Structures are given as structure tokens and as C-alpha cells.
Design a protein around this ligand. Sequence first.
Ligand code: HEM
Ligand code: HEM
Ligand code: JI4
Ligand code: JI4
Ligand code: H4B
Ligand code: H4B
Ligand code: ZN
Lengths: 404, 403
Amino acid sequence: GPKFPRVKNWELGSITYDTLCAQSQQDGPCTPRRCLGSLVLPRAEQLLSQARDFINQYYSSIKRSGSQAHEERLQEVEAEVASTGTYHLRESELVFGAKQAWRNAPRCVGRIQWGKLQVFDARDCSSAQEMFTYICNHIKYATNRGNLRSAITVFPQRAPGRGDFRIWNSQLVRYAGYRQQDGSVRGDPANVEITELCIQHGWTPGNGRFDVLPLLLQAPDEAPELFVLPPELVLEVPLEHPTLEWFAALGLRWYALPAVSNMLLEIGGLEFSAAPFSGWYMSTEIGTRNLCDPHRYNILEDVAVCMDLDTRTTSSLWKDKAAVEINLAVLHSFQLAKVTIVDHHAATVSFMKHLDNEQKARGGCPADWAWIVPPISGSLTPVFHQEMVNYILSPAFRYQPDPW
Amino acid sequence: KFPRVKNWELGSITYDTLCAQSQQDGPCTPRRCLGSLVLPRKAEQLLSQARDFINQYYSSIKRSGSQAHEERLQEVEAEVASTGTYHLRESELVFGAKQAWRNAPRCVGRIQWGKLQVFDARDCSSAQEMFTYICNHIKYATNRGNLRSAITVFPQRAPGRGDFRIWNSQLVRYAGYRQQDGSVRGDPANVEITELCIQHGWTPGNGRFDVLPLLLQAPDEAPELFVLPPELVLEVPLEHPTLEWFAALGLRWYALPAVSNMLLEIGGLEFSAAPFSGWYMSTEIGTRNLCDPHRYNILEDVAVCMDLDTRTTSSLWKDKAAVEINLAVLHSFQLAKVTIVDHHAATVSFMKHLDNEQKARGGCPADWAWIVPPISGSLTPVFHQEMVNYILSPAFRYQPDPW
Ligand code: HEM
Ligand code: HEM
Ligand SMILES: Cc1cc(N)nc(C[C@H]2CNC[C@H]2NCCNCCc2cccc(F)c2)c1
Ligand SMILES: Cc1cc(N)nc(C[C@H]2CNC[C@H]2NCCNCCc2cccc(F)c2)c1
Ligand SMILES: C[C@H](O)[C@H](O)[C@H]1CNc2nc(N)[nH]c(=O)c2N1
Ligand SMILES: C[C@H](O)[C@H](O)[C@H]1CNc2nc(N)[nH]c(=O)c2N1
Ligand SMILES: [Zn+2]
């Protein structure tokens, strides 16, 4: 057959070949000898070639590949580098790049939305105060009283010998995690570090399971400054079950806006160290990972006890039954509160749609199976039965070392 | 050049060192992970594969670098130099087979690997004899409902001639009847093999739960049809702890998962018919065989029994019914006293298996996507454990359909 990965969906029996992977300029961590695909992280002319490829992508997307504008923009980019070491994106270039990084993201299952992203340019930003302002506008725009809109706020790009713009928080909205003297954690155990950093940098802390963290915002060559979100800005949903009436008495709650804030956006060799982006939740993020992970909120035993289940034996499927209801509770509460959310069935169906669109448009779609398939009910969703090719395309969102 | 491996639940790190002893590439390259594909795209050598396996075996029994070890290295050097192959001793076959399972990275049950009954069926010259061997293996492995892992190893591949082969994918599988209306009555994954059986003589039933015959092929001969005696194949009718109606459905499932189209490789020899069984992990029946949409696809039917709202994905009727079905599978096995392991218990012992291997070998190579169950993934400790995947020999491989 065709000298490209053959790709099969074992439910429908259909076949495709991924020709897009040929475009990858970056190596992942696998090799003929061993697959390392379940690892969460693995550890000048270089700028030009990256730059040039981005520009060629730009011009192709607007169907001007070959044109004088295209070659003149190339000429322009190299002259800028040859004289200053770096170069700068035109506005609509940044907009296309940022959308393209979302589109290229292999662990993201909501990419059917990729073309509909609001891009706030914040490349003029000059202070931690200003960063705060921009961040609050972002939150306001995106949250939109529960009718959620996709957005990304691009702060200034890394410069040579000039420290980065950095949000220290991992998300814009996150709950505190307080280390006790029992050794237990009150709140979100995920956040014990950032909580402790917030206090040492001067936050007066609370003592709840759901205290929203302040932002630690860092502007070039400064210590970070601390900022508290006004509570009218951070929309939250109290959780309740449509039938089990005792569920609301548990006092569980989650915030509406998932907003990753420590990821590095890379476009044509330029690195934007600060560029928080936000969409809406898939229900299993809250209901299965945040609420049921052993190493997070871990409410499974609680709920199962309330549910009168036999928690002394694995074969009662008591964990399974409680996760289903915690999940139905996440869905029902957001729906009631009229905040956007997507269940794992709908979400995955729509990534299938996204797969055969990308098949027609680019002949491939980088996808990480282990992340695409949901944490409950995996084989009940259609992505489980779809084979996937995972490779790195630029523009990309990368992970980056923590600032401290 | 050594992979760091982390558990995200507990924070612990390990380096895999086993994976250097890999001698056979998989499908990933640095440019792209293919980790999620089900199948691969498709003298002097055989000698050194044999050397290495014999080196393996004399360490297993702490006898490395000794007289019996050299005179076995010479026996092989001699046999290959003369005939271009060699043969294994029963005890070596036996260590080979257990290791084939030890090495199987899609396998969740490998805590058990040291405990395998091994039938040497290498003196087999006819399909007829295979039928008998296959039956003893069934009687043994089933043991009244007290399942015991077993393998039967038929005669190796030989340069001149046809393979000994079992046409079936499992020793026990239900059949697939295509209907006027393109609807497949009975079991969909086996529509083709049902048709092969008909093509070669079989009168068929028309139930959903009819047990297929066996098609056994001896070298260079057409396959012969053999019918499993109904008292041999142990079945479990499905019912539910609380839901009285669930029985009504005629739901049933057979006790013995026995693979039989895979090929066992050792010290470079190839065993084209080496069928093996253990026991089921409940989600193979409850989630996959019954809720796959391309399998019996019972979900809707059930969710309607349960009287859930099916107009909409966000009621999670899919999830709700999937759990009742898995719970019926477990109950009904436990009521009729047949080994069954749930997915929570199974993955817990896998974690324990990983720690054992880490102490013994420097690693366990495994395939995260197969090892994580098809419901409640992150509810199991395996969801949260990084894993490295690679090929070690001895091994079970896929091999082509004979027709
Ligand atoms: C519109 C609704 C959206 C949904 C439902 C969605 C869904 C998801 C989900 C479920 C994950 C995996 C989450 C995890 O378990 O850690 C994810 C990962 C990711 N999502 Fe999306 N997303 C949406 C919008 C966006 C937007 C606007 C972006 C960026 C512009 C985005 C970018 C990403 C990226 C970059 C990852 C990888 C995260 C990582 O590697 O840790 N999503 N998304
Ligand atoms: C003793 C109880 C055992 C249990 C509970 C068990 C469980 C499993 C499960 C759940 C899978 C994934 C199956 C699938 O989704 O297709 C699997 C795969 C596998 N098992 Fe085990 N197994 C057991 C014993 C054995 C034995 C005795 C052998 C051989 C002696 C074995 C060899 C394999 C192999 C080679 C695979 C991968 C084959 C493939 O690609 O389908 N297992 N097992
Ligand atoms: C933009 C957007 C939309 C959406 N629905 N969901 C998302 C992922 C967010 C929300 N809920 C989880 C978080 N995803 C980011 C978490 N990063 C995963 C990798 C990781 C994990 C832990 C430690 C690490 F070092 C690295 C983003
Ligand atoms: C020994 C043992 C015990 C156990 N519990 N489970 C097993 C796997 C068997 C049983 N339950 C599923 C089946 N798995 C073997 C076949 N592989 C499944 C998918 C596949 C793979 C390759 C080609 C295909 F066309 C399809 C073995
Ligand atoms: C070890 C394993 O890779 C890790 O638990 C991954 C698996 N898949 C995931 N998938 C998603 N969407 N999010 C995750 O955090 C993880 N965790
Ligand atoms: C396409 C995907 O790799 C395929 O559906 C795999 C995923 N994981 C699996 N895991 C197990 N145990 N069994 C399977 O058949 C599969 N199928
Ligand atoms: Zn890989």
C-alpha cells in the first residue's frame, strides 16, 4: 500500500492513511525499540527555518503561496532576524498561529471548535498590574455569564537576555490545598505547592475545601506580584443530583472556566511564555478526575457510603456506580445553572467528526489515544475503537519548567 | 538511554533497564507514535536466538556456565549445522511458554505467570489427534469451574511444509448468522468463521448462543470439522442481583477464554498451533462482548429495561446500563462457581506484578491502552502508572489467517 501510517477504526472497519505526519519537524520520545507514549512528560538558522515554515503555512492558509506578498514577508522576516536576532508577528499571523496551535494539540478532544477562538493581543503589556487587567478581561469575556467562549490572551514574547512574562498559577482559577498537621490535605491536593508559594509571597489564606487562589503574575526581571480575583468574576456551580437529594448537602462545587495558564505557545520559533487559554469543561474532567482521583478530592468512598453501597469488596462495582452519579451530578448542575458543559459521549462523537474533516483538509490528525479516550466508559465512546497517530506539529502548545 | 517511569498517584519513579534486552523493533519511530495500532503493518540468526534462549534457560535454573549448559549449547550448534533447525526438550519448552506469557505486554493477568500447566502435544500427526488433545485441554482447564491456566503445544513449523493450525480464534466462540435483512443474528465478530464452518460441512443453529465447531488443519491438508461435546463446554447463564427481568434476556457466556490462532515463538522456533487459556476478567464479557456496538450491542435494550431516558447522552444511560451488565457478569459467575476476576481486583494485582518484575528484571514491558480497562479507567491504579512497551522473546505473536 501507501508508504504512510495506515489507520483503522475497528468499529466501522474503515481505513485511512495519515500523510500529515510527514510535516513534523520535532521528534517525540518513541523509537523502533520501545514505545514511550504513555509518558505524561518526557525530557539563528534554527530560528530562520522555523520562521520560514510558519510564514509558508500562513500564506497557504490564505491561498497566496508563491505570491510577492509571501516572498516579501519572507524577505522581511529574515532581514529582521539578521539585524536583531529576533522578529515579530503581524497581527493576523498571531491569530492564525494561535488557532493552529490548538488545532495541532494531540491531547485535546474539543478541537472541532478550533476555528472559533477569540484572540486577544496583549503584546503591548508592560506590567504585572496590566497583566492582571488583561487577565480579568479574558475571564469576563470567556465566562460571558455562563455562555462560555474560547479565548487566549497573548502576552509579550521571550526576548534574549530579558526575563520572561510568566503566570505562576497552572490555571487562572484553582482551589487552594492546605497541608495539615495530620498530614492530610484540606482542599485540592494538586495545589499544595502553589498555595504555599502564595502564602510566602503574602496571601492571607482561608480554610475551606474550595478557596479560590490569588494569581502570582511575573513581569520581566521582577519578583512576581500577587492579585486576588474579584469574586463576582469567578463563576461557580454548586453541585446537586437530579434524584439523590442528599448529594447537595455534601457542599461540593466547581468553577466554570477551565483556563490553562502555564503553557508555552510557540509560533514560527517565537516563544510566548505567557498566553492563558480557556474553553469549556468536559464533564469527566470534574466528575471523574478532580472529584474521584485518589490523589485529589477522592470523594468516591463518601458518596458510595451515602449511596448505601458495599464498600468492602471490589466486585460490588461500588466505585463504578458512585463515579457514574458524581458524573451525572456534574452534568445536571451545570445544565441547571445554565453554564456550558459537554458530556464525554457528545464530546467524543464530535472529535470523530473532527477526524474526518481533518482527513479531508490535511490528511491526518495528531492524536494521543490515552488522553483522547475518557477516564470513565472508554469503550462506550467511539474514539476507543479509532487508531491514532501521535506526532508533534508546530505551532504548538508546549509544557515549560515552573518559574521558581 | 534508560526510560524514567512515574506513577502519578503516589509520586514514585523507576528506571526500566529490561528494555535493552529487546531484539525486535515495534511500530513507533521518533517522528511518530503508533503505539495504538492493534496489529503490525505486515542458520546464523536462528542459531543465536537459540543460543540466547538456552542462555535464558540455564540462568532460570541457576545452572548458567556449567557442564549441562555447554553440552546443550553444543547439541544445538550441531543440530542446526546439520538440519538447519533443532528441537526443544520438554523442560525447556516449559520454561519458554511461561516466559512467553511473562513477556506479553497486553496481558493484565501476569501475576499468574509462574503457574501454567503445559501439555506437550508435539507427537501429533493428524487433525483427529489435535481434537483429542484440544478436548483434554478443555476438561483440564475448566476443572468443574475451578479454572486453571493451560497451554497445549502442537508441532513446530518446518521449512518443507504446511503448518499445524487452528482455524478458530478461540477454542470456544459463538456463531454469526447473516440474515436476509443484513442484520447479523448471533455473534458479529465471527460471521466469517461461521461461514467457513458451513462451507466445510456444518449444519448450523439459529440461536444467538450456538457454539461453533472446530476446524483443525494438519500440514498441507484441508481442515477437518470437529464438534465439541456439549457437556465439555461449560456455560454461565447471566442474571442480576436485584433486577429480576435481566434473566429473561437469554443472556449467557461460556466459561473458558482460550486463544488459538496465535503463534508461540521460542529460541527461534515457531509454534503455529499453541492454544492457551486462563480465566475471564469480567469486563471482557460485560463491556466488550456485550456492549461493543459491533458485537451483541445490548446496551440500548437494557437501558430500556432499566427505563432510563435514551433520547440524550447526558443522562448517561450508556454508563448506567454498562455497570448493571458488568455486575450481572460477576454475580452470575460467582453464583455458578466459576473463576472470574473483576477489573479492580485484576489491575491491583497487576500493580503488584509490576513491583515484582521491577525487583526481578528491571522492568516489565506493558501496553497501557490494553491494560487499562474499558470502563472506569482512572478508577483503577493502572490508569495512573506510566508504562514502557517493547518486545521480548519468548513471545506470542499474531500470524495470518490460514485461508
Ligand atoms: C471548547 C471546549 C473545549 C474542550 C471541551 C476541551 C477539552 C479538552 C480536554 C478534555 C483535554 C484533556 C484534559 C486533561 O485531562 O488534562 C484538553 C486538553 C488540551 N486542550 Fe482542549 N478543550 C476545549 C477548548 C480548548 C481551547 C481553546 C484550547 C486552547 C486554545 C484547548 C487546548 C487544549 C490543550 C493545549 C490540551 C493539552 C493539555 C495538556 O497537554 O495537558 N482546548 N482539552
Ligand atoms: C489467568 C488469568 C488471565 C487473565 C484474567 C487474563 C486477562 C487478559 C486480558 C483482559 C487481556 C486483554 C484481552 C483483550 O482485551 O483482548 C489479556 C491478553 C493476553 N493474555 Fe492474558 N489473561 C490470563 C491468563 C493468560 C494466560 C494463561 C496466557 C498465556 C498462557 C495469557 C496470555 C495473553 C496474551 C498473549 C494476551 C494478548 C493477546 C492479544 O493481543 O489479544 N493470559 N489477558
Ligand atoms: C483549555 C482547556 C479546556 C478544557 N476543557 N480542559 C483543559 C485542561 C485543563 C482543565 N482540567 C485539567 C487541565 N489540563 C491541564 C493539566 N495538564 C495535564 C498534564 C499534567 C497534569 C499534572 C501535572 C503535570 F505536570 C502535567 C483545557
Ligand atoms: C488467556 C486469556 C485470558 C483472558 N482473560 N483473555 C484473553 C484474551 C481473549 C479473551 N477476550 C478477548 C480475546 N483477545 C484475543 C484477540 N484480540 C482481541 C482483538 C483483536 C486482536 C487482533 C486481531 C483482531 F482482529 C482482533 C486471553
Ligand atoms: C500514566 C498516564 O499516561 C496518565 O495517567 C494519563 C493517562 N491519560 C490521561 N488523559 C487525560 N485526558 N488526562 C490525563 O491526565 C491523563 N493521564
Ligand atoms: C483502537 C484501539 O487500540 C483498540 O480499540 C484497543 C484499545 N485497547 C484495548 N484493550 C484491550 N484489553 N482489548 C482491546 O481489544 C483493546 N482495543
Ligand atoms: Zn509510541
